[PDB]
Write an enzyme that holds these catalytic residues in place. Structure first.
Site, PDB file in Angstrom:
ATOM      1  N   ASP A  57       0.911  -1.206   0.000  1.00  0.00           N
ATOM      2  CA  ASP A  57       0.000   0.000   0.000  1.00  0.00           C
ATOM      3  C   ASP A  57       0.907   1.201   0.000  1.00  0.00           C
ATOM      4  OD1 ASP A  57      -2.291   1.570   0.147  1.00  0.00           O
ATOM      5  OD2 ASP A  57      -3.211   0.272   1.731  1.00  0.00           O
TER       6      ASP A  57
ATOM      7  N   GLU B 134     -11.067   6.032   4.817  1.00  0.00           N
ATOM      8  CA  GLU B 134      -9.924   5.640   5.661  1.00  0.00           C
ATOM      9  C   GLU B 134     -10.032   6.253   7.083  1.00  0.00           C
ATOM     10  OE1 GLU B 134      -6.050   5.088   3.592  1.00  0.00           O
ATOM     11  OE2 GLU B 134      -7.160   5.561   1.774  1.00  0.00           O
TER      12      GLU B 134
HETATM   13  O1  LIG Z   1      -3.199  13.101  -0.106  1.00  0.00           O
HETATM   14  C1  LIG Z   1      -4.233  12.263  -0.669  1.00  0.00           C
HETATM   15  C2  LIG Z   1      -3.528  11.002  -1.148  1.00  0.00           C
HETATM   16  O2  LIG Z   1      -3.044  10.510   0.095  1.00  0.00           O
HETATM   17  C3  LIG Z   1      -2.908   9.107   0.134  1.00  0.00           C
HETATM   18  O3  LIG Z   1      -2.818   8.690   1.495  1.00  0.00           O
HETATM   19  C4  LIG Z   1      -4.132   8.463  -0.454  1.00  0.00           C
HETATM   20  O4  LIG Z   1      -4.074   7.126  -0.256  1.00  0.00           O
HETATM   21  C5  LIG Z   1      -4.090   8.502  -1.932  1.00  0.00           C
HETATM   22  O5  LIG Z   1      -4.954   7.413  -2.478  1.00  0.00           O
HETATM   23  C6  LIG Z   1      -4.341  10.037  -2.112  1.00  0.00           C
HETATM   24  O6  LIG Z   1      -4.033  10.448  -3.466  1.00  0.00           O
HETATM   25  O1  LIG Z   2      -4.680   5.070  -3.667  1.00  0.00           O
HETATM   26  C1  LIG Z   2      -3.711   4.058  -3.358  1.00  0.00           C
HETATM   27  C2  LIG Z   2      -4.026   3.353  -2.049  1.00  0.00           C
HETATM   28  O2  LIG Z   2      -4.192   4.351  -1.005  1.00  0.00           O
HETATM   29  C3  LIG Z   2      -4.176   3.735   0.250  1.00  0.00           C
HETATM   30  O3  LIG Z   2      -4.413   4.836   1.099  1.00  0.00           O
HETATM   31  C4  LIG Z   2      -5.342   2.698   0.441  1.00  0.00           C
HETATM   32  O4  LIG Z   2      -5.179   2.024   1.728  1.00  0.00           O
HETATM   33  C5  LIG Z   2      -5.452   1.731  -0.736  1.00  0.00           C
HETATM   34  O5  LIG Z   2      -6.723   1.008  -0.647  1.00  0.00           O
HETATM   35  C6  LIG Z   2      -5.326   2.477  -2.043  1.00  0.00           C
HETATM   36  O6  LIG Z   2      -5.313   1.589  -3.161  1.00  0.00           O
END
Ligand SMILES: OC[C@H]1O[C@@H](O)[C@H](O)[C@@H](O)[C@@H]1O
Ligand SMILES: OC[C@H]1O[C@@H](O)[C@H](O)[C@@H](O)[C@@H]1O
Ligand SMILES: *[C@@H]1O[C@H](CO)[C@@H](O)[C@H](O)[C@H]1NC(C)=O
Ligand SMILES: *[C@@H]1O[C@H](CO)[C@@H](O)[C@H](O)[C@H]1NC(C)=O
Ligand SMILES: *[C@@H]1O[C@H](CO)[C@@H](O)[C@H](O)[C@H]1NC(C)=O
Length: 604
Positions: free
Chosen positions: A287, A493
């Site tokens: 991840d 999340e």
């Molecule tokens: O800042 C937002 C970004 O933070 C990451 O933690 C999220 O997982 C990504 O899916 C997102 O583009």
């Molecule tokens: O966007 C990339 C990734 O972001 C992470 O924050 C999440 O836990 C994943 O489910 C996701 O695929």
């Protein structure tokens, strides 16, 4: 000629192509395959110079707001051209979270979130949704979807509970049909654990997040799952075996720990179980800064993160930003003997296996004839059918002797539509919709509840909208009935982790004011069960609509009796959050509504 290179010959067996390419590669070329980076840090030089294997869009990572399918194709093809220009010309694979449709993209069909799909008990409907989602992702030039989430959410206080089909692993297992929708059906011969994707109109899938993501203490996101092995295997693991049987191409590792061991450092489970016991032969991806998060604070010993993860058996690293440091550190470790070449060659064999199997060397570029698949009406029709089937009718009358409120008549002189969620497309889609966290208002193309009401009713029916009317307004309005929609705001999340599970105000107060003046059907938008006894006490009828997506007409299809209510709860509805965790089968099982509950209506 004797310019022939076996790996570039499409008629050769995948394994022969993999071996042929692998044998030609430098260390830099190998470690480059193992590196996934964000589009936000990608450039043609960066891709070429570091032999990059993969790119992604995280939530919200878009070429621009409002971008057309063609804009996406052109972005993806710009990055591919740079990758194809390397010495070996290995195409990159581009990933995205297409977890309820191609949900970062403006104009994409937005399907109900997973909890609602669980309510359908319809694996075929979920396969069709996979199919349609593959077409919408390939519309945008993207070849890889980070889905399905096969978490088995065991406490609804978790912010990702809506990404779980059910607290019951058997329902999650049934819904693994998304896989062959996204990727195609595997051949009759198929060996369980092998990756598969049918070709250029399908995408590579990702069973996530391995393993026990849904089992965490108090539903705290990304935290520790305390459960013995027997329970891990009985609850959290079984859908991964269904995924292997259906040829899932990749698996993403969880941020969560199991009995205090970070999944991203768990060799026994990633290599011992997933690879060696389930015989998974696709690739294992981390991840997002998952290896960083092995340590506390995150990122305080990146060298250790790299060692631990890659020794554990991870194949591709979702860096996604500090690529230079990742590549430098992993190079040092291999140069020093800390990580043997066998480990590198295994990871690269698996990455290349997926890429060749899925046809990416034969079709590295986007098909512009696919662009018009985005938001196609046949897919919206499917999403409308899924939204309707996901609805759970919890009450339809205050007493057993009342006339049943639903279905409502389409002809009435004047009706009221009210509530913070009646006319708000972003609220009805929830998280992972245009932005990572979702958003409020008219963020994409679709039909709100208000919009769907105005589309359904007889021409003589006057429809009044008021977001938060007072009791007098309602009592003075001359309304036949009211439809009132309230609930949770979008979240994703850790932001959605919630210990109280009470809906924001004004929600209840509006239901109270409306239902106190006229007979009312309450439509509850949520990612999970929430405190509901007060909403029930006010309401003539109440529907759990979950996060139904872009097609609000699925809601009115059932309200107005075009179809009967059929959905059944895919989770326990608790009486109090002090009971949690509390699941079908425990000892102290005292639900407000048990798993499988749902009232029905008959059509018309
Ligand atoms: O800042 C937002 C970004 O933070 C990451 O933690 C999220 O997982 C990504 O899916 C997102 O583009
Ligand atoms: O966007 C990339 C990734 O972001 C992470 O924050 C999440 O836990 C994943 O489910 C996701 O695929
Ligand atoms: C679980 O969350 C607690 C409370 O914030 C935290 O201190 C602990 O380290 C977390 N454990 C994990 C992620 O394994
Ligand atoms: C209930 O939880 C949510 C988010 O965690 C918060 O917005 C709300 O105000 C909370 N109330 C509490 C913890 O008392
Ligand atoms: C729906 O039909 C079934 C029998 O076909 C019956 O049990 C149920 O009570 C019916 N409700 C209505 C309004 O017809």
């Amino acid at each position: 000629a004797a310019d022939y290179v076996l790996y570039k010959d499409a008629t050769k067996p995948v394994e022969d192509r993999v071996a042929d390419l692998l044998g030609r590669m430098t260390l830099a070329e190998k470690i480059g395959q193992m590196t996934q980076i964000e589009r936000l840090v990608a450039t043609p030089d960066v891709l070429r110079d570091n032999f990059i294997g993969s790119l992604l869009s995280g939530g919200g990572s878009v070429p621009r707001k409002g971008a057309t399918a063609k804009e996406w194709q052109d972005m993806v093809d710009g990055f591919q051209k740079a990758c194809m220009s390397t010495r070996l010309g290995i195409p990159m694979i581009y990933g995205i979270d297409a977890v309820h449709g191609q949900n970062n993209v403006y104009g994409a069909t937005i399907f109900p979130h997973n909890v609602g799909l669980g309510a359908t008990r319809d694996p075929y409907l979920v396969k069709r949704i996979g199919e349609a989602t593959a077409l919408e992702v390939r519309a945008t030039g993207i070849q890889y979807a980070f889905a399905p989430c096969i978490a088995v959410c065991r406490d609804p206080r978790w912010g990702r509970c809506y990404e779980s089909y059910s607290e019951d692993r058997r329902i999650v297992q049934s819904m693994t049909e998304l896989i062959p929708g996204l990727q195609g059906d595997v051949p009759k011969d198929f060996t369980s654990g092998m990756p598969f994707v049918a070709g250029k109109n399908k995408v590579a899938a990702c069973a996530k997040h391995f393993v026990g993501d849904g089992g965490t203490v108090d539903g705290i996101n990304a935290n520790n799952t305390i459960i013995n092995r027997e329970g891990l295997m009985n609850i959290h693991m079984p859908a991964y075996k269904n995924a292997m049987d259906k040829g899932v191409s990749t698996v993403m590792i969880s941020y969560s720990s199991w009995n205090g061991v970070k999944m991203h450092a768990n060799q026994d489970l990633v290599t011992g179980y997933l690879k060696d016991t389930l015989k998974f032969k696709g690739f294992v991806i981390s991840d997002w800064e998952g290896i960083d998060r092995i340590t506390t604070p995150a990122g305080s010993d990146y060298s250790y993160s790299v060692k631990a993860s890659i020794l554990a058996g991870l194949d591709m690293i979702m860096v996604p930003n500090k690529y230079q440091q990742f590549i430098s550190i992993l190079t040092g470790h291999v140069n020093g003997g800390v990580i043997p070449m066998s480990r590198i060659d295994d990871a690269v064999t698996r990455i290349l296996r997926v890429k060749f199997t899925m046809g990416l060397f034969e079709n590295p570029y986007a098909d512009p004839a696919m662009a018009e698949q985005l938001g196609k009406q046949e897919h919206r029709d499917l999403a409308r059918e899924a939204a309707r089937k996901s609805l759970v009718l919890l009450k339809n009358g205050k007493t057993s002797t009342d006339a049943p409120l639903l279905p409502l008549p389409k002809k009435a002189p004047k009706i009221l539509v009210a509530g913070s969620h009646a006319d708000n497309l972003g609220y009805q889609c929830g998280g992972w919709t245009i932005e990572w966290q979702g958003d409020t208002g008219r963020t994409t193309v679709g039909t709100t509840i208000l919009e769907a009401v105005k589309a359904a009713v007889d021409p003589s029916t006057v429809v009044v909208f008021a977001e938060n009317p007072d009791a007098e307004f309602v009592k003075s309005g001359g309304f036949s009935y009211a439809i009132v929609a309230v609930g949770e705001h979008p979240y994703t999340e850790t932001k959605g982790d919630n210990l109280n599970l009470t809906i924001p105000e004004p929600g209840l107060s509006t239901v109270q004011a409306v239902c106190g003046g006229v007979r009312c059907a309450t439509v509850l938008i949520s990612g999970r069960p929430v405190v509901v006894q007060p909403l029930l006490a006010a309401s003539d009828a109440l529907v759990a609509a979950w996060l139904p997506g872009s097609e609000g007409q699925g809601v009115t299809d059932a309200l107005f009796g075009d179809f009967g209510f059929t959905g059944r709860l895919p989770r326990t509805w608790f009486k109090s959050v002090d009971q949690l965790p509390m699941n079908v089968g425990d000892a102290h099982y005292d639900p407000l509504f048990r798993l499988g509950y749902g009232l029905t209506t008959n059509a018309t």
